[PDB]
Design a protein around this ligand. Structure first.
Ligand SMILES: [Mg+2]
Ligand SMILES: [Mg+2]
Ligand SMILES: [Mg+2]
Ligand SMILES: [Mg+2]
Ligand SMILES: [Mg+2]
Ligand SMILES: [Mg+2]
Ligand SMILES: [Mg+2]
Ligand SMILES: [Mg+2]
Ligand SMILES: [Mg+2]
Ligand SMILES: [Mg+2]
Ligand SMILES: [Mg+2]
Lengths: 95, 64, 49, 95, 243, 110
RNA sequence: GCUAAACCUAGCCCCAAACCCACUCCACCUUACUACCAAACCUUAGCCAAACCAUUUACAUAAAGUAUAGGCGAUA
RNA sequence: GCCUGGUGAUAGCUGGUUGUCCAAGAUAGAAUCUUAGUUCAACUUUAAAUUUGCCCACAGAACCAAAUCCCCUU
RNA sequence: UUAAUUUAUUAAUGCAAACACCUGCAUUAAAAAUUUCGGUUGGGGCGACCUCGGAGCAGAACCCAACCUCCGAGCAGUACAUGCUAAGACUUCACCAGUCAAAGCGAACCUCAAUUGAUCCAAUAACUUGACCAACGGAACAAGUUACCCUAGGG
C-alpha cells in the first residue's frame, strides 16, 4: 500500500466537527510505499510430510509466496491460530 | 432583577437579534447562522455578495 | 492598594485573603485568558503599610 | 492589510510587523538595525556598536505600525522578569 | 425564504417518511452509523496530545484521513480498506515548484480463495494488504465475518458476509449434505458470529436494494371487499345470534 | 459596595478620610463617588491638554468657580482658566491640580 | 387648444412561522404528447490578489485575528 | 465559434460624480519593472499646548560678482 | 525556440513488487503545457548608459539639473585593545542606511575619497559567513516576434 502525508497542515476541527479541507490539503507527499519493505514470514503448522521446510505437526515460518500459493490451498498447512496450536499440542501429547 | 436583557425583547431575523454589523458582517453572520437552510440561488447570491464585499472593503477606498 | 482596600472595608483582614477575596472586593481584576497566572505583591507603599 | 476578514469580519494583524518590532505601551516601537549581522568583517567597531542597538521608530513609522496590528498588541503585559518592562510607562515628559 | 430543515438533514428525513420507515430497526441503525475506517493510506498519530518542538507546548492533534477513491472494480473484488489516491504533488518535493496532480493506484492480483462456510472457490481480485489481513484473521471466513462493513469496503465482501451469516443463521444442511460431522464442525468453528435470521437477511444491502426487498415483502394482492363485507356481516349476524 | 468601617483616628493609613458631619454650610456641595473618594479627576486630550475635573458638584457651581479660582491663583500668578458646566454640574480647570484640589476639598469638609 | 398631462393598486420585496408538490378520462423517451412484437459514479479549473508572476490567494458569544501556517509576502 | 456560468472578472487607462453660503489654501525632493502610478518628505488644512517667530548690527564664516549664512536692537 | 519552469500525458528503458501485462520509484525522449520578454531616451530605434566618489556648472552658509564638461571607484597596506561602554551632535533634502564623539571601565605608555548590497532564506555547536542580487532600495528562478495582432489610452 501507499502511505501519504499532507504537505499543508490541517487546522484542527474540534470534538464534534469534521475538518473542513481546502484545495491545498489535497497536495500529498509520499512518505512510504509498503511494497518496498523487508518482507515478513508467516507461521503455519504443516499437516503432512511436506518438503524440506518441515514435517508433520511442526510449526514453521515460510515465505509468504510458498505459504499462500502451495501450502494453504492444498491443505498442507493450517494457520498458526491459538485454536489449532491447542489441537496440535494435544496431538503431540498422544504419541 | 436582570432576569432578561432588553435584547431578548426584539423580534426579527434569527441572525440579527441583538447584534449590529455592517453589511459584510451581516452577510457572514447570515451565512454561518442560517445559510445551511437557505435556498439554493439565495445562498449563491449571498456567497457572491460576500466575495464582492470582501474585495471592496479590503482593497478599495480612500483611507488607509 | 491593599492598605487602601483594607481601610475601605472591601477586603476583610480578619479572614484569610485568598485570590477570591481580592476579586470579590474588586481590588484586582485578573483574567485567566490573556494568561494571567494570578497576583504578584508589589513593594510599592511598604512604608505606611 | 485585511480590514474585514471573511470568517470573523475583524481586522487582522500583519505578522511581519510582530515578527520584527516591539510595541512599548506608551506607543513607541522598538526595532533592530538593518544589517546588524551582515559583513561584520568590513565594519569599524563604532559602526558595529551602532548596529547592535535597539533603536526607536519615527512618528509616522509608529502610526503605520499601529494601523497594521490590532488591540491585542497594544495591551498592558505584566510579564515576570521582563527586560523591557521599565520602558513601558513614559517618565517625566513635558510634552 | 428559508427551509424549515437544513439540507444535510433532508436525506435523513427521507428515512422517516415512506417506504424507508417500515425497514427493520437493525437495518436503519446500520445505515445511521458513522464509525471511521482503519487508516490504510496514512500513519495515524499516536495519542490525542502532542508536544511540538518549535514552542515546546503540548497541542492537541487529530488525524485527518486521506480521501480514498474506489473504482467500481473495488466493489467487484476484495481490496483492503484501500483504493486510488487522487491527489497532487509538488514536483520535486519542494513547494516552490509546479503543483501537478498524481493518482496512486494499488497493486491488484487475481487470486483464488476457498470459503469453508459457503464451500466454494472464488476468483477474486485482491491486494497485498488484503492477503495480509486474511492471514491475520486466520482465514477468509474470519476475515469477512470479523471485518466491519465500513472497513471491508466492498459490496462483494458484504455479499459474502450475508451469505456466510445466513448459512450460520439457518444451520444449513446444504453445506455438506451427507456429511453432518463436517457441517457441525464448520458451524461450531464460527459459533462466535451467530446472528438471527431476521437480521442476517439485511446485512450489506444498499438502501435502494433494501427498499426493493421491503417493497416485495409488503406487496399484496388487495383483499376483495366481498370477503371483508362477508366477515363484517357474519360478525353482525353472530351479534344478533347472541341477542 | 460596603460602607467603609469606622476607624479610631483619621486620616487612615492610605490617607482616606470620611466626609465630615454635619455637611458644611457652603453654597455648594460636592458628593463623593461610589467608592467614597473625593471626585477630582485628571484628563488629557490632544496629548497636551492637561486639565482637571471636579465632577459631582451639586448646588451653586459659580461660588465653587470663584473659590477654586481664588485658591489656585497664588499657585499660578494668574487666575486659572476654567469652564463650568452648569448642566452636568462639573467644573473644568486647565492644568493638573488634582492633589491640591483633593486636599483642598478635604479641608473644606466634602 | 392640440399633443398631452395627472392618478392607486395590480402585484412584489424582506422576515417570521411551517418541512412542499404531484393519477377526471386519453396521450406522452419512436420524429415526446404516437393503442398493440424478440446503461451511473472518476480531485473543478480559472478569474482574481500578490500592484509582474512562477509556490500561494478567504468561500450565537468569547478565547482571537491568539496559537499557527506562509515566495515567513500577499495573505490564510 | 457561440451561449450560460465563475462575473459586479480585471483596468496605475478614458469618461462621469447631483442643494446653499462662508472660510483657509499652488511648485523643494528621495526611492520605485519607476517617470499615465504609488510611498515618504515638502507644502497645505483643522484642533491643541506653549513660547517666541519674522525683519535683523557690530563681531564672525579658506586656502587653493549680485548676494547669502549668522544676528541683538527695532 | 538553444527564454524560463515542468513532465501531469504518452513511448521506451532500469530497479522493485508479482510468479508478458499491471503497480510503485527513478531516467531518457517525444508531445506539449504554464509564464515572461526591465528602464533612460529632445516621438522612437542604433550606439551609449543604470551604483558610489572628486572638480566645474553652482565664484562667497547649505541645496541645485542635463543622453552636460572632465577625472576616478568596486581595493590595497598596516595593525591585532580594528576591546567594551557612553554624554552630546552631524546627516546627502523622507525612510533605510550613513558619519563624529568627550567622560568611563579595560589597556598601551589605523592610512586612503570612493573602495559597496536590505529582508527572507541558507551554511554553522557557536562566533560568524553568504550575490557583477552591477537593472547596484535588490521579484527566489521566465527570450525573439506579429503588414493577422487585439483592447484601453496618449499624440
Ligand atoms: Mg479623559
Ligand atoms: Mg496579479
Ligand atoms: Mg471596474
Ligand atoms: Mg493598473
Ligand atoms: Mg478666501
Ligand atoms: Mg526593482
Ligand atoms: Mg502608471
Ligand atoms: Mg537669536
Ligand atoms: Mg536630512
Ligand atoms: Mg532596477
Ligand atoms: Mg535601483
Amino acid at each position: 500500500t501507499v502511505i501519504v502525508e499532507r504537505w499543508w497542515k490541517v487546522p484542527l476541527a474540534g470534538e464534534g466537527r469534521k475538518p473542513r479541507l481546502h484545495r491545498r490539503h489535497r497536495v500529498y507527499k509520499l512518505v512510504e510505499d509498503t511494497k518496498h519493505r523487508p518482507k515478513e514470514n508467516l507461521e503455519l503448522i504443516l499437516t503432512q510430510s511436506v518438503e524440506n521446510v518441515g514435517v508433520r505437526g511442526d510449526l514453521v515460518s515460510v515465505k509468504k509466496s510458498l505459504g499462500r500459493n502451495r501450502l494453504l490451498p492444498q491443505g498442507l498447512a493450517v494457520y498458526a491460530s491459538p485454536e489449532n496450536k491447542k489441537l496440535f499440542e494435544e496431538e503431540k501429547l498422544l504419541r | 432583577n436582570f432576569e432578561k436583557h432588553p435584547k431578548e425583547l426584539i423580534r426579527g431575523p434569527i441572525w440579527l437579534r441583538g447584534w449590529k454589523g455592517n453589511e459584510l458582517q451581516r452577510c457572514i453572520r447570515k451565512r454561518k447562522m442560517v445559510g445551511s437552510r437557505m435556498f439554493a440561488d439565495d445562498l449563491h447570491n449571498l456567497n457572491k455578495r460576500i466575495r464582492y464585499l470582501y474585495k471592496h472593503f479590503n482593497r478599495h477606498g480612500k483611507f488607509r | 492598594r491593599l492598605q487602601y482596600l483594607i481601610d475601605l472595608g472591601r477586603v476583610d483582614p480578619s479572614q484569610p485573603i485568598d485570590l477570591t477575596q481580592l476579586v470579590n472586593g474588586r481590588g484586582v481584576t485578573i483574567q485567566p485568558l490573556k494568561r494571567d497566572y494570578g497576583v504578584q505583591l508589589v513593594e510599592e507603599g511598604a512604608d505606611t503599610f | 492589510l485585511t480590514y474585514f476578514s471573511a470568517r470573523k469580519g475583524k481586522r487582522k494583524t500583519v505578522k511581519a510587523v510582530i515578527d520584527r518590532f516591539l510595541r512599548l505601551h506608551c506607543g513607541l516601537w522598538v526595532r533592530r538595525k538593518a544589517g546588524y549581522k551582515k559583513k561584520l568583517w568590513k565594519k569599524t567597531p563604532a559602526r558595529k556598536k551602532r548596529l547592535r542597538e535597539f533603536v526607536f521608530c519615527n512618528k509616522t513609522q509608529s502610526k503605520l505600525l499601529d494601523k497594521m496590528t490590532t488591540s491585542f498588541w497594544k495591551r498592558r503585559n505584566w510579564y515576570v522578569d521582563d527586560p523591557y518592562q521599565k520602558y513601558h510607562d513614559r517618565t517625566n515628559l513635558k510634552v | 425564504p428559508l427551509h424549515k430543515y437544513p439540507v444535510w438533514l433532508w436525506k435523513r428525513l427521507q428515512l422517516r417518511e415512506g417506504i424507508c420507515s417500515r425497514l427493520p430497526g437493525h437495518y436503519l441503525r446500520s445505515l445511521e452509523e458513522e464509525r471511521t475506517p482503519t487508516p490504510v493510506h496514512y500513519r495515524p498519530h499516536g495519542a490525542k496530545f502532542k508536544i511540538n518542538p518549535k514552542n515546546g507546548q503540548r497541542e492537541r492533534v487529530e488525524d485527518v484521513p486521506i480521501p480514498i477513491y474506489f473504482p467500481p472494480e473495488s466493489q467487484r473484488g476484495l481490496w483492503g480498506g484501500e483504493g486510488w489516491i487522487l491527489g497532487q504533488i509538488y514536483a520535486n518535493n519542494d513547494k516552490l515548484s509546479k503543483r501537478l496532480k498524481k493518482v496512486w493506484k494499488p497493486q491488484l492480483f487475481e487470486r483464488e480463495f476457498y470459503s469453508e462456510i459457503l464451500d466454494k472457490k472464488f476468483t477474486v481480485t485482491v491486494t497485498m494488504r488484503t492477503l495480509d489481513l486474511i492471514d491475520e484473521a486466520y482465514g477468509l471466513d474470519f476475515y469477512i465475518l470479523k471485518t466491519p462493513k465500513e472497513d471491508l469496503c466492498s459490496k462483494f465482501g458484504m455479499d459474502l458476509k450475508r451469505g456466510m451469516l445466513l448459512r450460520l443463521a439457518r444451520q444449513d444442511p446444504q453445506l455438506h449434505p451427507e456429511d453432518p460431522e463436517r457441517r457441525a464442525a464448520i458451524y461450531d468453528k464460527y459459533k462466535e458470529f451467530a446472528i438471527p435470521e431476521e437480521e442476517a437477511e439485511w446485512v450489506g444491502l444498499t438502501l435502494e436494494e433494501a427498499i426493493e426487498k421491503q417493497r416485495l415483502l409488503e406487496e399484496k394482492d388487495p383483499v376483495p371487499l366481498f370477503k371483508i363485507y362477508v366477515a363484517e356481516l357474519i360478525q353482525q349476524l353472530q351479534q344478533q345470534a347472541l341477542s | 459596595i460596603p460602607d467603609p468601617p469606622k476607624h479610631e483616628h483619621y486620616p487612615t493609613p492610605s490617607g482616606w478620610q470620611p466626609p465630615r458631619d454635619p455637611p458644611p454650610n457652603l453654597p455648594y456641595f460636592v458628593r463623593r463617588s461610589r467608592m467614597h473618594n473625593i471626585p477630582v479627576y485628571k484628563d488629557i486630550t490632544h496629548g497636551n491638554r492637561q486639565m482637571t475635573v471636579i465632577r459631582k458638584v451639586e448646588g451653586d457651581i459659580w461660588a465653587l468657580q470663584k473659590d477654586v479660582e481664588d485658591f489656585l491663583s497664588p499657585l499660578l500668578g494668574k487666575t486659572p482658566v476654567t469652564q463650568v458646566n452648569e448642566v452636568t454640574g462639573t467644573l473644568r480647570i486647565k492644568g493638573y491640580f488634582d492633589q491640591e484640589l483633593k486636599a483642598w476639598l478635604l479641608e473644606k469638609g466634602f
